[PDB]
Amino acid sequence: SEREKRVSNAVEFLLDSRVRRTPTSSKVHFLKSKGLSAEEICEAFTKVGQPKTLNEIKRILS
C-alpha cells in the first residue's frame, strides 16, 4: 500500500547510523515533511523499537 511504502522508507531513515543519533523532534518533522501522517510516524517509530505516542507526535508537530 501507499501507506506502507511511506512507512518502509521511514524505517530506513530511522535505522540510519547517523540519523538515529539526531533529535527526535528533527526526525519527526523530517518525516512529516516527507508526507507521513502522525499515525504513520507512530508506526515507523514503533517498528524500529522506539514507540512514540500519537499525542507526543501531535505535540511535536504543533
Coordinates of all heavy atoms in Angstrom, one line a residue, unseen atoms left out:
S1 N 0.8 -1.2 0.0 CA 0.0 0.0 0.0 C 0.9 1.3 0.0 O 2.1 1.2 0.3 CB -0.9 0.0 1.2 OG -0.2 0.2 2.4
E2 N 0.2 2.4 -0.3 CA 0.9 3.7 -0.3 C 1.4 4.0 1.1 O 2.6 4.4 1.3 CB 0.0 4.8 -0.8 CG -0.4 4.6 -2.2 CD 0.8 4.5 -3.2 OE1 1.4 5.6 -3.4 OE2 1.0 3.5 -3.8
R3 N 0.6 3.8 2.1 CA 1.0 3.9 3.5 C 2.2 3.1 3.8 O 3.2 3.6 4.4 CB -0.2 3.5 4.4 CG 0.2 3.5 5.9 CD -0.8 2.8 6.7 NE -0.5 2.9 8.1 CZ -1.2 3.5 9.1 NH1 -2.3 4.2 8.7 NH2 -0.8 3.5 10.3
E4 N 2.3 1.9 3.4 CA 3.4 1.0 3.8 C 4.7 1.3 3.0 O 5.8 1.1 3.6 CB 3.0 -0.4 3.8 CG 2.0 -0.7 4.9 CD 2.6 -0.4 6.3 OE1 3.7 -0.8 6.6 OE2 1.9 0.3 7.0
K5 N 4.5 1.9 1.8 CA 5.7 2.4 1.1 C 6.3 3.6 1.9 O 7.5 3.7 2.1 CB 5.4 2.8 -0.3
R6 N 5.5 4.5 2.4 CA 6.0 5.6 3.2 C 6.6 5.1 4.5 O 7.6 5.6 4.9 CB 4.8 6.6 3.5 CG 4.3 7.3 2.3 CD 3.4 8.5 2.7 NE 2.1 8.1 3.3 CZ 1.1 7.8 2.5 NH1 1.2 7.8 1.2 NH2 0.0 7.4 3.1
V7 N 5.9 4.1 5.2 CA 6.4 3.7 6.5 C 7.8 2.9 6.3 O 8.7 3.1 7.1 CB 5.4 2.8 7.2 CG1 6.0 2.2 8.4 CG2 4.2 3.7 7.6
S8 N 7.9 2.1 5.2 CA 9.1 1.4 4.9 C 10.3 2.4 4.7 O 11.3 2.2 5.3 CB 8.9 0.5 3.7 OG 8.2 -0.6 4.1
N9 N 10.0 3.4 3.9 CA 11.0 4.5 3.7 C 11.4 5.1 5.1 O 12.6 5.4 5.3 CB 10.5 5.5 2.7 CG 10.5 5.1 1.3 OD1 11.1 4.1 1.0 ND2 9.7 5.8 0.5
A10 N 10.4 5.4 5.9 CA 10.6 6.0 7.2 C 11.5 5.1 8.1 O 12.4 5.6 8.8 CB 9.3 6.4 7.9
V11 N 11.2 3.8 8.0 CA 12.0 2.9 8.9 C 13.5 2.9 8.4 O 14.4 2.9 9.2 CB 11.4 1.5 8.8 CG1 12.4 0.4 9.4 CG2 10.1 1.5 9.6
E12 N 13.7 2.9 7.1 CA 15.1 3.0 6.6 C 15.8 4.3 7.1 O 16.9 4.3 7.6 CB 15.1 3.0 5.1 CG 14.6 1.7 4.5 CD 14.5 1.6 3.0 OE1 15.1 2.6 2.4 OE2 13.9 0.7 2.5
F13 N 15.1 5.4 7.1 CA 15.6 6.7 7.6 C 15.9 6.6 9.1 O 17.0 6.9 9.6 CB 14.6 7.8 7.4 CG 14.8 9.1 8.1 CD1 15.7 10.0 7.6 CD2 14.1 9.4 9.2 CE1 16.0 11.2 8.3 CE2 14.3 10.6 9.9 CZ 15.2 11.5 9.4
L14 N 15.0 6.0 9.9 CA 15.2 5.9 11.4 C 16.3 5.0 11.8 O 16.9 5.1 12.9 CB 13.9 5.6 12.1 CG 12.8 6.6 12.0 CD1 11.5 6.1 12.7 CD2 13.2 7.9 12.6
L15 N 16.5 3.9 10.9 CA 17.6 3.0 11.2 C 19.0 3.5 10.8 O 20.0 2.9 11.2 CB 17.3 1.7 10.5 CG 16.2 0.8 10.9 CD1 16.0 -0.4 9.9 CD2 16.4 0.3 12.3
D16 N 19.1 4.6 10.0 CA 20.3 5.1 9.5 C 21.3 5.3 10.7 O 20.9 5.9 11.7 CB 20.1 6.3 8.7 CG 21.4 6.9 8.2 OD1 22.1 7.7 8.9 OD2 21.8 6.6 7.1
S17 N 22.6 4.9 10.6 CA 23.5 5.0 11.7 C 23.7 6.4 12.1 O 23.9 6.7 13.3 CB 24.9 4.5 11.2
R18 N 23.6 7.4 11.3 CA 23.7 8.8 11.7 C 22.4 9.4 12.1 O 22.3 10.1 13.1 CB 24.4 9.7 10.5 CG 25.9 9.4 10.3 CD 26.4 10.1 9.1 NE 27.8 9.7 8.8
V19 N 21.3 9.1 11.4 CA 20.0 9.7 11.7 C 19.6 9.3 13.1 O 19.1 10.1 13.9 CB 19.0 9.3 10.7 CG1 17.6 9.7 11.1 CG2 19.3 9.9 9.3
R20 N 19.8 8.0 13.5 CA 19.4 7.5 14.7 C 19.9 8.3 15.9 O 19.2 8.3 17.0 CB 19.7 6.0 14.9 CG 21.2 5.7 15.0 CD 21.4 4.2 14.9 NE 20.5 3.5 15.9
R21 N 21.0 9.0 15.8 CA 21.6 9.8 16.8 C 21.1 11.3 16.8 O 21.5 12.1 17.7 CB 23.1 9.8 16.8 CG 23.7 8.4 16.9 CD 25.2 8.4 16.9
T22 N 20.3 11.7 15.9 CA 19.8 13.1 15.8 C 18.5 13.2 16.7 O 17.9 12.2 17.1 CB 19.5 13.4 14.4 OG1 18.4 12.7 13.9 CG2 20.7 13.2 13.5
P23 N 18.1 14.4 17.0 CA 17.0 14.6 18.0 C 15.7 14.0 17.4 O 15.4 14.1 16.2 CB 16.9 16.1 18.1 CG 18.2 16.6 17.7 CD 18.7 15.7 16.7
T24 N 14.8 13.6 18.4 CA 13.5 13.0 18.0 C 12.7 14.1 17.2 O 12.1 13.8 16.2 CB 12.8 12.6 19.2 OG1 13.5 11.5 19.9 CG2 11.4 12.1 18.9
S25 N 12.7 15.3 17.7 CA 11.9 16.4 17.0 C 12.4 16.6 15.6 O 11.5 16.8 14.7 CB 12.0 17.7 17.8 OG 13.3 18.2 17.7
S26 N 13.7 16.5 15.3 CA 14.2 16.6 14.0 C 13.7 15.4 13.1 O 13.2 15.6 12.0 CB 15.7 16.6 14.0 OG 16.2 16.5 12.7
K27 N 13.7 14.2 13.7 CA 13.3 13.1 12.9 C 11.8 13.2 12.6 O 11.3 12.8 11.5 CB 13.5 11.8 13.7 CG 15.0 11.5 14.0 CD 15.0 10.3 15.0 CE 16.4 10.0 15.5 NZ 16.4 9.0 16.6
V28 N 11.0 13.6 13.6 CA 9.5 13.7 13.4 C 9.1 14.7 12.4 O 8.3 14.5 11.5 CB 8.9 14.0 14.8 CG1 7.4 14.3 14.6 CG2 9.1 12.8 15.7
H29 N 9.7 15.9 12.5 CA 9.4 16.9 11.5 C 9.9 16.5 10.1 O 9.3 16.8 9.1 CB 10.1 18.3 11.9 CG 9.3 19.0 13.0 ND1 8.2 19.7 12.8 CD2 9.5 19.1 14.3 CE1 7.7 20.2 13.9 NE2 8.5 19.8 14.9
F30 N 11.1 15.8 10.0 CA 11.5 15.3 8.7 C 10.5 14.4 8.1 O 10.1 14.6 6.9 CB 12.9 14.6 8.9 CG 13.4 14.0 7.6 CD1 14.4 14.7 6.9 CD2 13.0 12.7 7.2 CE1 14.9 14.1 5.7 CE2 13.5 12.2 6.0 CZ 14.5 12.9 5.3
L31 N 10.0 13.5 8.9 CA 9.1 12.5 8.3 C 7.7 13.1 8.0 O 7.1 12.8 6.9 CB 8.9 11.4 9.3 CG 10.1 10.5 9.5 CD1 9.8 9.4 10.6 CD2 10.5 9.8 8.2
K32 N 7.3 14.1 8.8 CA 6.0 14.8 8.4 C 6.2 15.6 7.1 O 5.3 15.5 6.2 CB 5.7 15.8 9.5 CG 4.3 16.5 9.3 CD 3.2 15.5 9.4 CE 1.8 16.3 9.4 NZ 1.7 16.9 8.0
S33 N 7.4 16.2 6.9 CA 7.6 17.0 5.7 C 7.7 16.1 4.5 O 7.5 16.5 3.3 CB 8.8 17.9 5.8 OG 10.0 17.1 5.8
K34 N 8.1 14.8 4.6 CA 8.1 13.8 3.5 C 6.7 13.3 3.3 O 6.6 12.4 2.4 CB 9.1 12.7 3.8 CG 10.5 13.1 3.9 CD 11.0 13.8 2.6 CE 12.3 14.5 2.8 NZ 12.7 15.4 1.7
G35 N 5.7 13.7 4.0 CA 4.3 13.3 3.7 C 3.7 12.2 4.6 O 2.6 11.8 4.4
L36 N 4.4 11.8 5.7 CA 3.8 10.8 6.6 C 2.8 11.6 7.5 O 3.0 12.7 7.9 CB 4.9 10.2 7.5 CG 5.5 8.9 6.9 CD1 6.6 9.3 5.9 CD2 6.1 8.1 8.1
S37 N 1.7 10.9 7.8 CA 0.7 11.3 8.8 C 1.3 11.1 10.2 O 2.3 10.3 10.3 CB -0.6 10.6 8.6 OG -0.4 9.2 8.9
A38 N 0.7 11.7 11.2 CA 1.2 11.5 12.5 C 1.1 10.0 12.9 O 2.0 9.4 13.5 CB 0.4 12.3 13.5
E39 N 0.0 9.4 12.4 CA -0.2 7.9 12.7 C 0.9 7.1 12.1 O 1.4 6.1 12.6 CB -1.6 7.5 12.2 CG -2.8 8.1 13.0 CD -3.1 9.5 12.6 OE1 -2.5 10.1 11.7 OE2 -4.1 10.1 13.3
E40 N 1.3 7.5 10.8 CA 2.3 6.7 10.1 C 3.7 6.9 10.8 O 4.5 6.0 10.9 CB 2.4 7.2 8.7 CG 1.2 6.7 7.9 CD 1.0 7.3 6.6 OE1 1.8 8.2 6.2 OE2 0.0 7.0 5.9
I41 N 3.9 8.1 11.4 CA 5.2 8.4 12.1 C 5.2 7.5 13.4 O 6.2 6.9 13.7 CB 5.3 9.9 12.4 CG1 5.4 10.7 11.1 CG2 6.5 10.1 13.4 CD1 5.4 12.2 11.3
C42 N 4.0 7.4 14.0 CA 4.0 6.4 15.2 C 4.3 5.0 14.8 O 5.0 4.3 15.5 CB 2.5 6.4 15.8 SG 2.1 7.9 16.6
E43 N 3.8 4.6 13.6 CA 4.1 3.2 13.2 C 5.5 3.0 12.9 O 6.1 2.0 13.2 CB 3.2 2.9 11.9 CG 3.3 1.5 11.5 CD 2.6 1.3 10.2 OE1 1.6 1.9 9.9 OE2 3.1 0.4 9.3
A44 N 6.2 4.0 12.2 CA 7.6 3.9 11.9 C 8.4 3.8 13.2 O 9.3 2.9 13.3 CB 8.0 5.1 11.0
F45 N 8.2 4.6 14.1 CA 8.9 4.6 15.4 C 8.7 3.3 16.1 O 9.6 2.8 16.7 CB 8.6 5.8 16.3 CG 9.4 7.0 16.0 CD1 9.0 8.0 15.1 CD2 10.6 7.1 16.7 CE1 9.8 9.1 14.9 CE2 11.4 8.3 16.4 CZ 11.0 9.2 15.6
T46 N 7.5 2.8 16.2 CA 7.2 1.5 16.8 C 8.0 0.4 16.1 O 8.6 -0.5 16.8 CB 5.7 1.2 16.8 OG1 5.0 2.1 17.6 CG2 5.4 -0.2 17.2
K47 N 8.0 0.4 14.8 CA 8.7 -0.6 14.0 C 10.2 -0.6 14.2 O 10.8 -1.6 13.9 CB 8.3 -0.5 12.5 CG 7.0 -1.1 12.2 CD 6.6 -0.9 10.7 CE 5.5 -1.8 10.4 NZ 5.0 -1.6 8.9
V48 N 10.8 0.5 14.7 CA 12.2 0.4 15.0 C 12.5 0.3 16.5 O 13.6 0.4 16.9 CB 13.0 1.7 14.4 CG1 12.8 1.7 12.9 CG2 12.5 3.0 15.1
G49 N 11.4 0.0 17.3 CA 11.6 -0.3 18.7 C 11.6 0.9 19.6 O 12.1 0.7 20.8
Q50 N 11.2 2.0 19.1 CA 11.1 3.2 20.0 C 9.8 3.8 19.8 O 9.6 4.9 19.3 CB 12.2 4.2 19.6
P51 N 8.7 3.2 20.4 CA 7.4 3.7 20.2 C 7.2 5.1 20.7 O 7.6 5.4 21.8 CB 6.5 2.7 20.9 CG 7.4 2.0 21.8 CD 8.7 2.0 21.2
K52 N 6.5 5.9 20.0 CA 6.1 7.3 20.4 C 4.6 7.3 20.4 O 3.9 6.8 19.5 CB 6.6 8.3 19.5 CG 8.1 8.3 19.2 CD 8.9 8.7 20.5 CE 10.4 8.8 20.2 NZ 11.2 9.1 21.4
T53 N 4.0 8.0 21.4 CA 2.5 8.0 21.4 C 2.0 9.0 20.3 O 2.8 9.9 19.9 CB 2.0 8.4 22.8 OG1 2.2 9.8 23.0 CG2 2.6 7.6 23.9
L54 N 0.8 8.8 19.9 CA 0.2 9.7 18.9 C 0.2 11.2 19.5 O 0.5 12.1 18.7 CB -1.2 9.3 18.6 CG -1.9 10.2 17.6 CD1 -1.2 10.3 16.2 CD2 -3.4 9.8 17.4
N55 N -0.2 11.3 20.7 CA -0.2 12.7 21.3 C 1.1 13.3 21.4 O 1.2 14.6 21.3 CB -1.0 12.7 22.6 CG -2.4 12.3 22.5 OD1 -3.0 12.5 21.4 ND2 -3.0 11.8 23.5
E56 N 2.2 12.6 21.7 CA 3.5 13.1 21.7 C 3.9 13.6 20.3 O 4.5 14.7 20.2 CB 4.5 12.0 22.1 CG 6.0 12.5 22.0 CD 6.9 11.4 22.4 OE1 6.5 10.2 22.6 OE2 8.2 11.7 22.5
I57 N 3.6 12.9 19.2 CA 3.9 13.3 17.9 C 3.0 14.6 17.5 O 3.6 15.5 16.9 CB 3.6 12.2 16.9 CG1 4.5 11.0 17.1 CG2 3.7 12.7 15.4 CD1 5.9 11.3 17.1
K58 N 1.8 14.6 18.0 CA 0.9 15.8 17.7 C 1.5 17.0 18.4 O 1.5 18.1 17.9 CB -0.5 15.5 18.3 CG -1.3 14.5 17.4 CD -2.7 14.2 18.1
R59 N 2.0 16.8 19.6 CA 2.6 18.0 20.3 C 3.9 18.4 19.6 O 4.1 19.6 19.4 CB 3.0 17.6 21.8 CG 3.8 18.7 22.5 CD 4.3 18.3 23.8 NE 5.0 17.0 23.9 CZ 6.3 16.9 23.5 NH1 7.0 17.9 23.0 NH2 6.9 15.7 23.7
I60 N 4.7 17.5 19.1 CA 6.0 17.9 18.4 C 5.6 18.7 17.2 O 6.3 19.7 16.9 CB 6.8 16.7 18.2 CG1 7.4 16.1 19.5 CG2 8.0 17.0 17.2 CD1 8.0 14.7 19.3
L61 N 4.6 18.3 16.5 CA 4.2 18.9 15.2 C 3.3 20.2 15.4 O 3.1 20.9 14.4 CB 3.4 17.9 14.4 CG 4.2 16.7 13.9 CD1 3.4 15.7 13.2 CD2 5.4 17.2 13.0
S62 N 2.9 20.5 16.6 CA 2.0 21.7 16.8 C 2.9 23.0 16.8 O 4.0 23.0 17.3 CB 1.2 21.6 18.1 OG 2.1 21.5 19.2

